[PDB]
Amino acid sequence: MEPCLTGTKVKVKYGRGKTQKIYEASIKSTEIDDGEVLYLVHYYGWNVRYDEWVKADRIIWPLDKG
Amino acid sequence: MEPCLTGTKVKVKYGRGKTQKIYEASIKSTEIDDGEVLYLVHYYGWNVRYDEWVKADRIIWPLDKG
C-alpha cells in the first residue's frame, strides 16, 4: 504494498519527435541511480518482452494513487 | 517491499532562504496527487510528530537504491 507506487496506473511517453506516442502502463518496480528515480513499466496488453526501465520524465502520473 | 522506494535513505530540503537546512530522512510512503508524486518522510532521530508529506523537489536522492 500500500505505501508503494507499484501498481499505479500511469501513461508513458514512447519514441521521439513526430512519431512519439503515449501508452498506458503500470509501475512494476523502482530504481534509484545517481540521484534520480527510474521506473520499470509494464505496458498493458503488451508482451512482457516490452517491459522497460524509464526515466522519471517519461511518466505521466494520474490525479490520484488509486 | 523490494520493488518500492519505501525505506530509501534520502536527504530532504527543510525551510527556505538563508536558514534552509538538509536533513537525513527515510521514505515512509508515497502519494500521487494531481499528476505529481509526494513522499511521507521520517527524519532520522526526530520525533514522529515531525514526519511530513513533501513534494518531490524537496528530496535529494542517493546514488543507489541500497
Cell 512519439, located at residue: A20
- Chain A residues in contact with B8 by the CB 8 A cut-off are 32
The answer to whether the Cβ–Cβ distance between A33 and B3 falls below 8 Å is: no
**With an 8 Å Cβ cutoff, is A28 touching chain B?**
yes
Give which of A24, A40, A51, A30 is closest to B59, Cα–Cα.
A30
Q: Which site among A26, A32, A40, A63 would you substitute to test the B interface, given the most B Cβ atoms closer than 10 Å to its Cβ?
A: A32
In which residue are the cell numbers 508524486 written?
Answer: B37
Residue B49's SS3 state is: helix
Check if the beta carbon of residue A5 is closer than 8 Å to that of residue A16: no
Q: Which residues pair with A10 in a beta bridge?
A: A25
Q: Which residue from A29, A30, A25 is spatially nearest to A10, judged by alpha carbons?
A: A25
Rounded distance, CA B18 to CA A1, Å?
39
d(CA A53, CA B51): 30
Bridge-partner residues for B9, per DSSP?
A: B26
Measured between beta carbons, the chain B residues lying within 8 angstroms of A62 are 32, 35
Enumerate residues 30 to 59 of chain A having a beta carbon within 8 A of any beta carbon in chain B: 30-37, 40
Beta bridge partners of A40: A29, A53
Q: Phi and psi (nearest 5°) for B35?
A: 80, 10
What is the stated resolution of the deposited model, in angstroms? 1.9
Which of A1, A4, A28 is closest to B37 using CA atoms? Answer: A4
Name the amino acid, one letter, at B31.
E
Residue B7 has phi, psi (to 5 degrees) of 90, -15
3-state secondary structure of B51: coil
Give me the number of domains chain B comprises: 1
- CB distance B30–A61 less than 8 Å? no
User: CB-hemisphere CA count at 13 Å for A18?
Assistant: 0
What burial class does residue B19 get, using C-beta atoms within 10 Å of its C-beta: 0-12 exposed, 13-18 middle, 19+ buried?
A: exposed
Closest residue in chain B to residue A59, using alpha carbons only: B35
Residues 6+ apart with CB under 8 A from B20: B13, B14
CATH for B1: 2.30.30.140
Q: Domain of A27?
A: 1-66
Distance between CA A23 and CA A57 in Å, rounded? 14
